[PDB]
From a paper:
To determine if small-to-large amino acid mutations at these hydrophobic residues can decrease active site volume and increase resistance to AA, we generated multiple mutations at V496, V497, and I177 in [name] followed by kinetic and structural characterizations. The substitutions of V496L and V497I may push the loop where G490 is located toward the center of the channel. To probe the acquired resistance mechanism of [name] mutants, we determined the crystal of [name]–I177F (2.45 Å), [name]–V178W (1.77 Å), [name]–V496W (1.59 Å), and [name]–V497F (1.87 Å). In the crystal structures of I177F, V178W, V496W, and V497F, the occupancy of [2Fe–2S] cluster is 0.64, 0.72, 0.63, and 0.77, respectively. The overall structures of the [name] mutants I177F, V178W, V496W, and V497F displayed high similarity with the wild-type [name], with the RMSD of 0.123 Å (888 core Cα atoms), 0.275 Å (994 core Cα atoms), 0.142 Å (1,034 core Cα atoms), and 0.283 Å (994 core Cα atoms), respectively. The obvious difference was in loop 490–497, which forms the side wall at the narrowest point of the substrate channel. For example, in the V496W structure, the side chain of W496 induced the loop 489–493 move toward V178, which made the chamber entrance narrower and might block AA to access the active site.
Numbering used by the authors:
A (entry chain A), B (entry chain A): 4 to 12, 16 to 574
Write the structure that this text describes.
Amino acid sequence: SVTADPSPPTNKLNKYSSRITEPKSQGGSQAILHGVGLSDDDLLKPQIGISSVWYEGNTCNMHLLKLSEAVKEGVENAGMVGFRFNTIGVSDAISMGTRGMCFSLQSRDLIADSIETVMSAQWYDGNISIPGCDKNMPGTIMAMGRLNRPGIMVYGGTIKPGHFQDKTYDIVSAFQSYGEFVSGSISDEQRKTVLHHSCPGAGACGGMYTANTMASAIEAMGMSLPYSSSIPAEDPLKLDECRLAGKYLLELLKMDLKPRDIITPKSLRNAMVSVMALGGSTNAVLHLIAIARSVGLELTLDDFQKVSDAVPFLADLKPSGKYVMEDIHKIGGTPAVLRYLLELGLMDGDCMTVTGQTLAQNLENVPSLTEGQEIIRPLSNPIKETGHIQILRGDLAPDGSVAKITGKEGLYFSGPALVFEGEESMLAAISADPMSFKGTVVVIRGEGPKGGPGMPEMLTPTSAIMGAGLGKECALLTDGRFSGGSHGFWVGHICPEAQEGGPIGLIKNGDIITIDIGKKRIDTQVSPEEMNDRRKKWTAPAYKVNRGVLYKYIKNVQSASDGCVTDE
Amino acid sequence: SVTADPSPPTNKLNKYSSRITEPKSQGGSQAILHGVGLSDDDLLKPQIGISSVWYEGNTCNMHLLKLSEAVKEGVENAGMVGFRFNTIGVSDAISMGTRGMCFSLQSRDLIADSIETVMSAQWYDGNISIPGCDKNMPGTIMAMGRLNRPGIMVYGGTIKPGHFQDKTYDIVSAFQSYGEFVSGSISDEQRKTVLHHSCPGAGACGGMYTANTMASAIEAMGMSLPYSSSIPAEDPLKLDECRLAGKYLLELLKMDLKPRDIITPKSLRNAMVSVMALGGSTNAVLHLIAIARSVGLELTLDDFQKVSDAVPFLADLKPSGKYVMEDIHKIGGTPAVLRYLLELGLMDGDCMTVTGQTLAQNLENVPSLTEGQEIIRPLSNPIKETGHIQILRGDLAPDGSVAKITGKEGLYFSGPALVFEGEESMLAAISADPMSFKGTVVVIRGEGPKGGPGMPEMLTPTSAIMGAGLGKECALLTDGRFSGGSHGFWVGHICPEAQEGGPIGLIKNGDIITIDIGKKRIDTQVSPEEMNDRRKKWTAPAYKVNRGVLYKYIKNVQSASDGCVTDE
Ligand code: FES
Ligand code: FES
Ligand SMILES: [Mg+2]
Ligand SMILES: [Mg+2]
């Protein structure tokens, strides 16, 4: 029983805004509303909060004001009042590699707080959110779940791949350019050319990374309109979707079809099914748990393992494959993918969606995957018989951990631990003495929600390992997160994190660590009694901040196995 | 020693953005920056985060996107790169009277978190903030203090008074209209006419309420440019100020004149001096404490009492007087007011400001208060010999409380307590049985930062008291806040709040409460031993929420005497 936001004061379409538009005792409210341009007749209409995440310093978000204007126009075209407002967001592509990354994950929870705040204070009847980026998307859904007022999330759209001189690039090309330069693979001028053509325009990062994972998952959950996740950012049809969201939201107000009517155990499973089938990001574990909690439901790591075991990986999409979200768009979009998964019996078609109809009804007449397409494998010949996402426990991750397992890595890794108290000291060690890493289980700890602080996503450690030729010769463990595609036994989200005294914070250099994918365990040769000896002598490190938004995060955040929720 | 945000990697103007624009290892960052439109030459420039609080559902904020575009143009005209982003805010005029008010105060702290987040993640060198409303203003300064990067706050400007048929209105006219209708003073049609003409356009609420108090105080603190606080929202000179902020910020980057160089004990006192001289809001106590903490300084309730005792109330401004901020603008603006206070020896002129010069240097050549003006009283004939703001302690507010004391109320009030566990039950009681309030000390408790939750500002209780003719016949105590002008012994901010087991939560109906302004005490006839007896049997009420942004507020917020900071 979630208690968060104001209740409305049955067939009324302005259930909330009537609190301030109708009583004479709210004459001050009505005076403001006339001052912002509402007529007496406008005061009778539903009021839609239109929350975008526009900002100019990221390609994923710089276009969203234009989208928000189209959403407002369509809300007015549907007989409603549209009130635009706008939250913050941050760019992982900009902050990756820097301590700015400590601020990224928590911006999800701040976006949720932001939209909840405005919708509650202004008494809006419904919400249309326009995220464009990584964390923006689940933050908007969490606010929707807390408020439980009719809402639709309009994905801003993925960016198109960059093209120059018969070469094709994305943000990962730009990430990888430094290492290829240092290795001698490319010249400084080729490096510079990659940076000028990797990000050609607006839109979220282009492969099946976190943004496309979550947009697809949220469409599969029924909380975006069909095709929202797969229409590209700069596409004319994205603007048309914006101009239609008001029509759809009107119908949701008439039926009073709310987020907790749409986000259910079965539609959460539908979202998880799309993550497994498409090879989506391990970050979806954090965000789908957070979304489930926001509507008062439960979702555990073991629920992810069960769906992973039930759903084959079918999609030849970056990072693990070759294609990108624009290629999905060209062969029928996300609805064509979900139609195939539904036909295979992998999804529950009875779930209500923001179209006002069920998932099966949305998908009944959509064009199917284009004949001859090579992106989505048939069930008979999947890329992997089960999903990439694997939950591991064992001695060193007793409360869980998350890995992306392709099947190319083998079933076991065993090696002496090489332990670093953060990303910076690992990178200096691999720079000075790369051969000391050969055969080791590398542990980068102190990078969890409280220890980091902020659970930063880390990319430099793994590109340093790949560039040293050590990809098949070591394993990587962290209480933080690893960015992009895996190329080995790379395990993140290890719980309890080191800052909390979890076993990962008790590992010492030379401890033999064995990762067993089949048993789903990360174990240590150190005896349980010696581990307990170390725990008795362990003292928590001082927090790295004492003020500001990150210290509030330290005070509030739950574990990664609990989705790093902050409001419980 | 504040530890919150990233440090820069001496004469460089791009101290922070060089972290991502210069190293080859940040090629991903640079690819994004080219995609958003930066040239190779642009990468060399400082990057300014331009944070507005635009949203369409409030007159105070609906214009701020236009202002933000002018700020960006001036940043580019100054040889810098401008990156706009935008936070949330909420409208007290809309939410007043409703549980939406529970979300208002905390939006200050969420704005602070929001701007801190973006500036840290994106590595911006400086900040220009464009608030328009109540809580927006101190939230932007708190972010500035945490980051300690050069910053300027551009006030959006006050709204102009409304005019219709030789009558003049503001938001308070609209608030008061319901009660005048119920009393028979005005007809329904006159009531409706007030609502259509009370708020004529963009801008913050027009008298010396919280917005104008804090804009004036922040200008007096040196963190806005001269006249920022007094130029009206729709004025051409406000746009010109926006287009100049970049020139001024460039110079701050050259001198590296930072917020903790500008916000000092002496400039905090300067801000407090302006609050006392102008009759500013008791809310300035919360916000100036929060601003002081954000730069690692201390500011106590007793510091406010000392300044109040030292500074006469001089300004004939609403709520207590007749004039409004536009009238100040017409007689020389905030700089003319501060020039007079400086000439009187009430302020410290050596404080550095965002002009790159001292306060005395800014004021040396500004036009003085217009000859003949009747708004600012001479020191010889003040409206009150000391400031309105009074700190009270005593048995029932051992950790402090705040009142606005005009001098019209007498020095003492004594009466039996009439106790309500929230605003709703008080209002029902005064509706049913108004005479039962005559002679009482009314206690509205459970309205503090944790109890409310959110320390709501309350207006309906006091207009109900005025409308029942009880203004001179009772006193009002709360652990929350009272809105607008006082018309009696109306004390808010009582600490500890009732939810925390403070004495206010132990008062029983009939307890004789005596308010003594001269002794600065709110005392009870109940013996200390009986109070302690009650405390031993007291149990905290359940919190009113268990999820969402308000439950996080309950988890994080300090007392009103500590400025309701949330990050400590
Ligand atoms: S930084 Fe926005 S999705 Fe990658
Ligand atoms: S609601 Fe914005 S200052 Fe009054
Ligand atoms: Mg990312
Ligand atoms: Mg207010």
